[PDB]
Amino acid sequence: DAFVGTWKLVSSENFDDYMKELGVGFATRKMGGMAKPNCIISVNGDVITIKTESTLKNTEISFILGQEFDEVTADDRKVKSTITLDGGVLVQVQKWDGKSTTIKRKREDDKLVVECVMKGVTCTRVYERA
Numbered sequence: 001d002a003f004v005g006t007w008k009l010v011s012s013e014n015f016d017d018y019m020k021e022l023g024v025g026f027a028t029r030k031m032g033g034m035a036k037p038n039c040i041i042s043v044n045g046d047v048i049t050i051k052t053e054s055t056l057k058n059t060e061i062s063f064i065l066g067q068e069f070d071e072v073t074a075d076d077r078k079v080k081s082t083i084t085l086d087g088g089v090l091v092q093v094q095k096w097d098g099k100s101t102t103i104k105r106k107r108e109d110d111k112l113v114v115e116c117v118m119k120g121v122t123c124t125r126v127y128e129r130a
């Protein structure tokens, strides 16, 4: 839909503070903060696939809207995730260990804007079509 495509990271705010909230260690934050991932989003039937490629780590999730699924995150957290479409915005919650983080993916102008929230910290990442 508006989300399908290959999307390259062009800007990032507060990603270090977000990773710290996730409990990511210094050495790994350093590497994570300077990688420039590509995100490839596809849809076939009920199933949406989000594949992220970077020099540090790759990840891929496949999901149906509204259906909880198990996911291993790029920092190797084992989480329960649920993604829904809410007024044009893909809203994901990840839950693990009594904790949770929310990730909103939205389409704005020519951008894919991703806002991640954990506790008081809000990180905003912007991707553009590659």
Ligand SMILES: COCC1(c2nc(C3CCCC3)c(C)c(-c3ccc(F)cc3)c2-c2nnn[nH]2)CCCC1
Pocket (backbone or CB within 6 Å): 019, 024, 028, 029, 031, 032, 033, 035, 036, 037, 039, 052, 053, 054, 056, 057, 058, 059, 074, 075, 103, 114, 115, 116, 125
């Ligand atoms: C497939 O990994 C891509 C990288 C990534 N790594 C991490 C951890 C692993 C290293 C420490 C943090 C996270 C949490 C995310 C992320 C960001 C926003 C999110 F909303 C969700 C995950 C992403 C990411 N994914 N897509 N863009 N950046 C991008 C840069 C280094 C690896």
